[PDB]
Design a protein around this ligand. Structure first.
Ligand SMILES: [Mg+2]
Ligand SMILES: [Mg+2]
Ligand SMILES: [Mg+2]
Ligand SMILES: [Mg+2]
Lengths: 158, 160
């Protein structure tokens, strides 16, 4: 059923170049990967400070090609399975396009991947903005971010 | 306060090339523009069939540059006014990027335009999936589409 996700990326008003993605399933499974295809030279100051230093070391198997990350996710999301998939992100318009561009144009998205991501901030506001935990130390690590989204969703829906 | 919008675009897995944008405010104001800047040749079968035919004639004043559309939206969304700006779209991830890319990077979006677009499909499901009127015949005209979203929003929230 439900997956909470986050991405880091380099975006220049034209393209969204994916750095990393973290996805946590409501059932407890977690996926994290760092693309070996983004060019770190194209990173702006803010990404260079806040995103790049938090990445795994280069010898880590967490570093995957774009094709591997897409295949990992088709497996992780159970694209062939019983369940309806619901994707959730916090202020995730760009995150949604970064995710979907792992398959290509929106035309190429597998049939069972939803064409919209539910917006966790919208849910939170619709429930009167209940108090959240303070943001983690390691924000801008996408897996840390994704785990925190699930934590919030659980708090919001209790 | 709330604006409902829709965009049409040529998207290829790499970029989103804006064809048109329609925005409708809750107070009745409407904005619609078609960009002079996208390359119609690039469009696939679907956009050639369902989008390009609905666009205004070449001599329409609705055809504007991307710079003009940004300037027009800064004025239409009342970016220096005191109301909080709330944007809504239906299944709006790519729409939101197509809108915000009129200012270039994310970084450059005026501080007063929100960094996310509320998802009307998410609201619908939430308030119990109420039966909605049928989509208009003339959908894929961004302004007709945006009007219809405002309509559905009013219906969905009418007993909130
Ligand atoms: Mg994020
Ligand atoms: Mg690859
Ligand atoms: Mg993040
Ligand atoms: Mg649309």
């Amino acid at each position: 059923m439900r997956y909470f996700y986050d991405t880091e990326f380099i975006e220049d008003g034209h393209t969204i170049e994916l750095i990393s993605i973290g996805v946590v399933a409501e059932d407890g499974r977690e996926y994290y990967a760092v693309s070996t295809e983004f060019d770190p030279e194209r990173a702006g100051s803010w990404v260079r400070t806040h995103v790049l230093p938090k990445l795994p070391p280069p010898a880590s198997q967490l570093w995957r090609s774009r094709q591997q990350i897409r295949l990992d996710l088709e497996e992780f999301l159970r694209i062939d399975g019983t369940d309806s998939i619901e994707l959730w992100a916090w202020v995730g318009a760009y995150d949604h396009v970064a995710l979907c561009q792992l398959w290509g144009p929106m035309t190429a998205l597998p049939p069972t991947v939803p064409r919209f991501t539910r917006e966790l901030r919208q849910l939170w506001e619709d429930r009167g903005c209940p108090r959240m935990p303070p943001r983690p130390r390691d924000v801008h690590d996408a897996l840390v971010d994704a785990r925190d989204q699930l934590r919030r969703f659980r708090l919001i829906t209790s």
